[PDB]
């Protein structure tokens, strides 16, 4: 976790709280110590104390996977990670409690379109702020290189053919 990115962690958490506050004023939510849903009263104005940071917490983890591992590629990779951590949680807890079978206990290349978009939304939400802040990231001519490799392979094959024709 770099210093400047750690400094931006709190700023982006604040900005996401701003976005969520706009959403919940559009919905209608007034601060109130009593916990309820049908009374539309919550003390952090249904996002509770910890629930307000359940989404801020894995931003540092997303950055750590960024550093340990173009833009569309990391978007889909962070989507895959966001769903894989959820699958790990789910399967470990279900192995502990001996529960039923989840339809999401399958490789990521078989999931339904909505299950991928659900985490792709959070992925793009955390990515657009990194883009506006000037962070160039990648995954971490091509045709000419391919042609050159083919030529090298052809040279090897020609050496082999010469060896064969010599016999």
Describe, in plain words, how this protein is organized in 3D.
- The chain has 167 residues and is an all-alpha fold.
- The chain contains five helices and two strands.
- A two-stranded parallel ribbon has the order 1-2.
- The radius of gyration is 25 Å and the shape is elongated.
- The N and C termini lie far apart (62 Å).
Order of helices and strands: HEEHHHH
Give the helix proportion (percent range). Answer: 55-70%
Radius of gyration (CA) equals 25 Å
Oligomer: part of a larger assembly
- How many strands, what sense, and barrel or not for the largest sheet? 2 strands, parallel
What structural class do you assign from the helix and strand content?
A: mainly alpha
How many strands in all? 2
Q: What separation lies between the terminal Cα atoms? A: 62 Å
For the biggest β-sheet, the strand order reads 1-2
Question: Which descriptor suits the 3D outline?
Answer: elongated
Q: How many separate helices?
A: 5
PDB class: membrane protein
Keywords: calcium, calcium channel, calcium transport, ion transport, ionic channel, metal transport, ER/SR membrane, ryanodine receptor, ryanodine, receptor, wild type, membrane protein
Entry title: Structure of recombinant RyR2 (EGTA dataset, class 1, closed state)
Name: Ryanodine receptor 2
């Amino acid at each position: 976790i770099p210093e400047k990115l750690e400094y931006f962690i709190n700023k982006y958490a604040e900005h996401s709280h701003d976005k969520w506050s706009m959403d919940k004023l559009a919905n209608g939510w007034i601060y109130g110590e009593i916990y309820s849903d049908s009374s539309k009263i919550q003390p952090l104005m249904l996002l509770s104390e910890k629930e307000k940071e359940i989404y801020r917490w894995p931003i540092k983890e997303s950055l750590k996977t960024m550093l340990a591992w173009d833009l569309h590629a990391m978007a889909e990779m962070m989507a895959e990670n966001y769903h894989n951590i959820w699958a790990k949680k789910k399967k470990l807890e279900l192995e502990s409690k001996g529960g039923g079978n989840h339809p999401l206990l399958v490789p990521y290349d078989t999931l339904t379109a909505k299950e991928k978009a659900k985490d792709r939304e959070k992925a793009q939400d955390i990515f657009k702020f990194l883009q506006i802040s000037g962070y160039v990231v990648s995954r971490g001519x091509x045709x000419x290189x391919x042609x050159x490799x083919x030529x090298x392979x052809x040279x090897x094959x020609x050496x082999x053919x010469x060896x064969x024709x010599x016999x």
